[PDB]
Amino acid sequence: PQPISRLEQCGINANDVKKLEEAGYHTVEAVAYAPKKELINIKGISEAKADKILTEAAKLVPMGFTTATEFHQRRSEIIQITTGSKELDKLLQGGIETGSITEMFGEFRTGKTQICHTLAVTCQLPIDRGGGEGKAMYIDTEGTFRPERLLAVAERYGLSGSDVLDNVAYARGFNTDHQTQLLYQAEDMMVESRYALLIVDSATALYRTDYSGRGELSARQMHLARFLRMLLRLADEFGVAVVITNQVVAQVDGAAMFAADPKKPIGGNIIAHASTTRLYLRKGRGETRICKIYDSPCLPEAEAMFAINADGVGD
Amino acid sequence: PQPISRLEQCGINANDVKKLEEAGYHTVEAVAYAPKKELINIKGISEAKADKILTEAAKLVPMGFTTATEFHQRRSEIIQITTGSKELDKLLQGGIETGSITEMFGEFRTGKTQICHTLAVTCQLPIDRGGGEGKAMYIDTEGTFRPERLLAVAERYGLSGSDVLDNVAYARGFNTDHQTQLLYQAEDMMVESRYALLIVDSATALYRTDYSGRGELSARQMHLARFLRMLLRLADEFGVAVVITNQVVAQVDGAAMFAADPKKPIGGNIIAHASTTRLYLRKGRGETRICKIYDSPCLPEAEAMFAINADGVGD
Amino acid sequence: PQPISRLEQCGINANDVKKLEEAGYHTVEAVAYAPKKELINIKGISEAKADKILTEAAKLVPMGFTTATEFHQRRSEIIQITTGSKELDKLLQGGIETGSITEMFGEFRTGKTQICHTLAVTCQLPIDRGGGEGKAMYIDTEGTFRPERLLAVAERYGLSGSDVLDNVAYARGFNTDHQTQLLYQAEDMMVESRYALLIVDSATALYRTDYSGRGELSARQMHLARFLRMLLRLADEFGVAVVITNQVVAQVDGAAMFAADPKKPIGGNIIAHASTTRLYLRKGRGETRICKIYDSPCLPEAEAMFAINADGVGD
Ligand SMILES: Nc1ncnc2c1ncn2[C@@H]1O[C@H](COP(=O)(O)OP(=O)(O)NP(=O)(O)O)[C@@H](O)[C@H]1O
Ligand SMILES: Nc1ncnc2c1ncn2[C@@H]1O[C@H](COP(=O)(O)OP(=O)(O)NP(=O)(O)O)[C@@H](O)[C@H]1O
Ligand SMILES: Nc1ncnc2c1ncn2[C@@H]1O[C@H](COP(=O)(O)OP(=O)(O)NP(=O)(O)O)[C@@H](O)[C@H]1O
Ligand SMILES: [Mg+2]
Ligand SMILES: [Mg+2]
Ligand SMILES: [Mg+2]
Ligand SMILES: [Mg+2]
C-alpha cells in the first residue's frame, strides 16, 4: 500500500511522480507491477526515464524468487472472509479466499446480490468473527444495492446497523470505461485504509450489452482481459478479495443435453482463465439454492445448500 | 434528470452536442453514463473530442464513490407507485420501486393488462399519501391499449376524465426495431415532464415472430440485451418505475416440471438477469387471479392471491 | 551443463565479463550462443568490439562429429518425470524427458496448471524414479500457485511437504521484462545446484488500445520467439526441462468450418515451430479428463483416462 509519493523522496523528480499520479498510478507496487512500455507510453519524459524509475521501484519491492516457503507463510494471513452460511463457508474451505478473483455466476435468482450483501457486511467483522475487519466496497452495474438488505443482514451478527452502513463504499458502474475509471479511483481510495473486500456486481453485464456482436464488437475480449488483469493487480498489491459476479448464456446447438446444463458462463476464455475461484449457483425450492464449484485450483466441486432467508444467506 | 442545458456551452461547442442529440442522447446523464465507444462510432466525432466530452460529462455528475449512508439518504424518498390491493402493498411492499424494471408475467387470462392500465392511471394523483404527480407511457405492441377502459376506470380514484387521456403517451410498435427505437423519442419527450412510470407491454412478444427460428436467435437476443440495458439507463437517469410484462412459452420436453409450471417466460438469460423483480401469475378460480414472487433483490419469496373485476385491480 | 571457468581474464577480462553479464550470458556456452551484433551492442561503456574469443572457444561447445551411439545411450536412461497416473504414463513413453520444451493447453476446467504443480513436486524424485532429483523452478503470473497442490502431491508419493516448499523457486510479476529478467537470473540460480525443470506456467498479458479505437500491433510474437529462445537455450545448455502452459482461443472455426476442434492455441506460428512437444487437454465427464497430443516428432496420437482428487492427480 506504499504510495507513489514514497518513491518521490527516494531520488525521484516531482514531474514523474505528478505524471504518474495524474495517469492513475497511486502505488509504487503497482508501478513495479506495470509493463515497461505501458509506463513509457504516457507523456514522453517517462520514455527515457523508465530505465531509472523501474529500478528505483524494484530496489525496494521484492520481485525475485518468493520461494514457496515464503509464499505459504504469507498465505497464512489470508483472511478467507466468511460467506454467511456454515455450509457454503465450509465447502469453500473456511469461506471466500482473499487476494484473488473469486467470481460467481448463475442463472437469475441464484442469490448473487444476496451473497454480495452478506460479504459486504461480514467482511467488517473481526478476524475471529469471520471477516477482515476492513471497510467494504460495492460497484454495482445495475443499481440493485438495496442497503435495507444490508441493515437486515447486520442484525444477525449483532453488529450495529449504525456503522455497517457508513463502513461501505458504493459506486455505480454505467459502462466499461466507467468500470475501469472507478477501479482507478478505488486504487487510491483504499490505499490509506484497510479494505478487505471489493464488490463488482455483474462485471460483464456492460460488456455484454455494449460490445454486442461477432467481430464487429469482439475487442471486448481484450478489454475484459485488461479489466480482470487490473482486478488481479489490485488483489495482489492490496490483498483485497475481489468478488465480481457473472451472468450466463445458453447452448443452442443441435444437442439439448450438456455439461452443467445448457447454461454456461459468458465471457469465453478471457474471463475463464483470469478467474481463480468460480462458483456456479442454481435454483432449488423456496429459499434453498445449490452451489457448485465450477473452476478453482484449490477446491473440489460439490454441492452446498444455501437458503436466502429474511436476513441474507443462511439456513 | 437534468437535460442538455450546459453541454452546448461547456467550452465544447453546440455542434457536436447537436450530433449527440440527433444520434440518440438528449441529456447530460446518458452521455456521462455512456462509454467512449458509442460516441467514437458516431460520424464526425474524433477520439480526442470524444475523450474531452466524456471527461466533461463525467465531471458534470458525481459518478464516483459515495458512502452507503448517502445511498440510504437517497433511498428514503423512493417514489414507489401506490398499488391498488392492500395485501399487494403488503407483498410488493409499497408498490413498485423507482430504480428497477418490473417483469410481471404469466399465461393467457392471468391479469397482466389490468396491472398495466391501473399502474398507468395511478401516481398521476397525490392520493394514498403518494406525492410526485406524474404521468404514464403506454407503449403497446400486442393490442391491449384500449383507451376506453383507460378513461372509464378513474372511478375508485375518482379523477374526472380526459386529463388522464391527455396525461398518457402512447406508441404502438409492431417490430422489435420499433420498441427500441421509440425509447429515444420517449426520453426526448419526457426529459422536461415528470414521469413516474413507463409501460411497455409484451415487449418480449415482438421477439417471437420478428426474429424467428434458431440461427436467427443471436441477433434477437443481442437486440433484447440492448433494449433492456437502455431501460436500465433510463431508470437510473430519470428515476421512474419502468414495467414490462412477459409472455410464456411451453416446455415440451416433459421433464423437470413434475406437473408444476409447464411454462417459461419468453426471452432467455438476457431478460432473466436485467429485471429487478419478476412476478409469476397463475389464474385461480372465477376472477381471483393468483400471484407469486418469482424473484426480487429484497422482497421475500411469498405467494399471495389477488383478484380482478371492473375498475381493475382489487382485493 | 555449467561454465568451465576458463575464459575469465583470458581474452575477456572480468570487467568485460560484467559488461556481457549485464545482458545475461553467464555460462561461457551461453555467451558463445549469442549473436555478435548483440555482444557488440550492449552499452557505450560495454562496446566489446574485439570479441571473437567466443568463436575460438569452440572446445566448450559440443560441435563436431559425435557418434549417435552416445546420444542413444545418454537418452536411453533419460530422466522422465511421471505425472502420477499410470494411464497418463502409458499414453506417453515418458515424453517429459529433461532437455526439451513441454507445452500444454486446454479449456479452463481440465487442469492445465494442475499437472504443472504435480510435475514440479515429483521433479525431486530420484533418477531411477519419475523425477530429476532437484528443486524445480516455477513462475506464475496467473497467481494460481495454491500450496495445497504442492503438499498433496508430495503426500501422494510419500514425501515431506517441507522439501517441496523450498524445492520450488516461485516468482511473480505482470510486466514482460519481469519474466525476461527472471529468466536472466535463472542461469544465476542454475549454477549452484541441480533442479532439471524450469516451468514458467502462465504467460504474461499486455494492455492495448483502451481509448484509441480498436485493433493494434503487439510485438508479442517476437517477444514470445525470444522468450522461447531463452527457454530452449537454457534447456540445451543446462540439460534442463522447460514447461509452458497455453491459453485456448475459440471462434477460429467460425468461417464455415465443421468446428470439430474450435479451440486453437494462442501464439500463431511462433508457438508452433519454437516448440517440440505439444499436448492437448480435453474436458471429460467430471474429473475423468482425457489427454491428447497435437504434434510430437516421436509420438503417435494417444488418449488416456486420468482423474484429479484431493491428494493430487490420480485414479
Ligand atoms: N427476505 C427474503 N426472504 C426470502 N427470500 C428472499 C428474501 N430476499 C430475497 N429473497 C430471495 O432470494 C432471491 C435472490 O435473488 P438475487 O440475489 O437478486 O439473484 P441475482 O441472480 O443476483 N438477480 P438477477 O441476476 O437480476 O436475476 C430473491 O430474488 C428472492 O427469491
Ligand atoms: N481438490 C480438488 N479435487 C478435485 N478437483 C479439483 C480439486 N481442486 C481443483 N480441482 C479441479 O481443477 C480444476 C481447475 O484446474 P486448474 O489447474 O486450475 O485449471 P486452469 O486452466 O489453470 N484454471 P484458470 O486459470 O481459472 O483457467 C477445477 O475446476 C476442478 O475441477
Ligand atoms: N368481470 C369482469 N368484467 C370485465 N372485465 C373483467 C372482468 N374480470 C376481469 N376483467 C378484465 O380482465 C383484464 C385482465 O387482463 P387480461 O384479461 O389478461 O388481458 P389480455 O388483453 O388478455 N392480456 P395479454 O394478452 O397478456 O396482453 C382486466 O383489465 C379487467 O378489465
Ligand atoms: Mg441472486
Ligand atoms: Mg395483460
Ligand atoms: Mg496443470
Ligand atoms: Mg513432432
Side-chain angles (χ1 to χ4, degrees), chain B residues 111-114 201:
Chain B
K112 298 167 322 300
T113 300
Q114 98 275 49
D201 204 9

Side-chain angles (χ1 to χ4, degrees), chain C residues 83-88 156 287-289 304-309 311-315:
Chain C
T83 58
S85 186
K86 184 69 225 89
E87 297 88 2
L88 279 174
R156 176 187 268 288
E287 50 197 354
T288 87
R289 294 89 196 268
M305 221 303 276
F306 66 108
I308 317 194
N309 50 21
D311 66 312
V313 174
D315 286 335

Side-chain angles (χ1 to χ4, degrees), chain C residues 237-265:
Chain C
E237 147 71 1
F238 299 101
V240 287
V242 168
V243 176
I244 316 285
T245 325
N246 228 301
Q247 171 198 146
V248 289
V249 54
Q251 168 46 26
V252 199
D253 289 1
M257 178 22 55
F258 46 66
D261 206 358
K263 313 166 182 64
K264 202 209 179 308

Side-chain angles (χ1 to χ4, degrees), chain A residues 37-38 41 176-177 180 184 211 218-227, chain B residues 36-37 40 47, chain C residues 206-218:
Chain A
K37 104 175 71 153
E38 241 309 346
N41 294 354
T176 75
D177 219 31
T180 67
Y184 279 158
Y211 279 116
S218 205
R220 97 166 196 189
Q221 296 285 331
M222 312 76 201
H223 203 334
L224 173 63
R226 294 203 290 264
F227 194 67
Chain B
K36 157 180 281 312
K37 162 200 56 84
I40 66 163
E47 194 268 332
Chain C
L206 88 168
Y207 274 51
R208 287 159 147 177
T209 58
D210 211 296
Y211 304 157
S212 51
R214 299 193 259 288
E216 75 297 296
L217 324 158
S218 68

Side-chain angles (χ1 to χ4, degrees), chain B:
Chain B
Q2 296 318 298
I4 290 188
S5 55
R6 186 224 101 71
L7 300 180
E8 316 100 297
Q9 294 173 334
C10 58
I12 293 124
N13 308 75
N15 45 4
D16 47 352
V17 189
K18 282 159 183 60
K19 284 121 206 170
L20 274 204
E21 277 267 20
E22 57 90 21
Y25 304 104
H26 319 109
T27 199
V28 297
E29 283 89 5
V31 190
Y33 308 149
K36 157 180 281 312
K37 162 200 56 84
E38 290 148 25
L39 283 84
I40 66 163
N41 283 25
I42 305 183
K43 46 160 198 291
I45 304 310
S46 77
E47 194 268 332
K49 181 156 56 62
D51 191 8
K52 159 82 181 150
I53 50 64
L54 176 49
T55 48
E56 183 274 311
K59 72 190 200 283
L60 194 137
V61 289
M63 46 83 181
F65 268 103
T66 74
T67 327
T69 52
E70 319 307 296
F71 202 61
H72 253 288
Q73 306 282 2
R74 144 86 69 182
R75 164 67 38 160
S76 74
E77 59 264 354
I78 166 178
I79 171 167
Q80 280 214 19
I81 205 143
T82 56
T83 167
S85 298
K86 278 56 126 183
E87 204 281 338
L88 266 298
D89 208 320
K90 302 192 340 284
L91 198 32
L92 311 209
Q93 305 191 9
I96 292 311
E97 319 172 5
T98 301
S100 90
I101 302 121
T102 35
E103 182 191 321
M104 314 213 248
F105 76 84
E107 99 198 326
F108 88 105
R109 181 217 40 190
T110 321
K112 298 167 322 300
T113 300
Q114 98 275 49
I115 326 177
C116 277
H117 103 284
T118 193
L119 269 43
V121 154
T122 55
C123 210
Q124 289 201 1
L125 32 68
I127 326 185
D128 208 73
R129 267 304 283 128
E133 200 274 337
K135 301 215 232 180
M137 200 136 201
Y138 214 170
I139 281 170
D140 181 42
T141 46
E142 165 67 54
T144 76
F145 181 43
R146 222 71 83 231
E148 289 97 11
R149 172 148 191 143
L150 197 54
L151 66 66
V153 85
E155 302 317 291
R156 188 178 90 77
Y157 330 90
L159 177 286
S160 74
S162 177
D163 81 73
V164 279
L165 227 63
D166 210 330
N167 261 333
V168 294
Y170 150 96
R172 206 271 299 142
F174 194 30
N175 48 352
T176 88
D177 152 38
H178 263 200
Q179 74 172 358
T180 278
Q181 93 93 25
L182 53 78
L183 276 172
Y184 294 21
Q185 286 202 7
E187 77 183 22
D188 173 47
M189 168 291 155
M190 37 43 63
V191 71
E192 83 260 14
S193 157
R194 172 104 189 85
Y195 275 32
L197 166 131
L198 176 128
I199 292 263
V200 76
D201 204 9
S202 73
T204 63
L206 306 97
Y207 295 113
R208 208 169 195 154
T209 89
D210 304 352
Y211 283 0
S212 50
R214 184 181 87 162
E216 211 186 353
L217 174 61
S218 283
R220 155 190 143 162
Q221 294 291 106
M222 289 155 188
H223 215 205
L224 168 64
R226 258 194 268 106
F227 158 73
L228 263 184
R229 178 57 187 124
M230 153 175 324
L231 287 211
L232 263 79
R233 106 187 205 193
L234 296 212
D236 293 352
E237 157 180 348
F238 288 106
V240 318
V242 54
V243 180
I244 63 147
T245 85
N246 218 67
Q247 303 210 325
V248 297
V249 69
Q251 284 171 174
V252 316
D253 54 291
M257 67 266 319
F258 28 95
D261 290 6
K263 53 181 59 60
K264 219 181 83 168
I266 187 183
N269 315 327
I270 284 294
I271 187 161
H273 290 140
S275 67
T276 50
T277 194
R278 308 162 97 207
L279 311 196
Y280 183 176
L281 313 182
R282 77 196 191 279
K283 193 263 196 155
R285 277 71 191 170
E287 292 283 14
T288 54
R289 331 275 167 132
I290 328 289
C291 189
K292 154 152 196 190
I293 298 295
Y294 216 169
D295 82 323
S296 174
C298 45
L299 307 188
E301 176 292 284
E303 310 88 5
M305 58 93 86
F306 71 107
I308 193 42
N309 49 45
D311 81 331
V313 282
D315 303 71

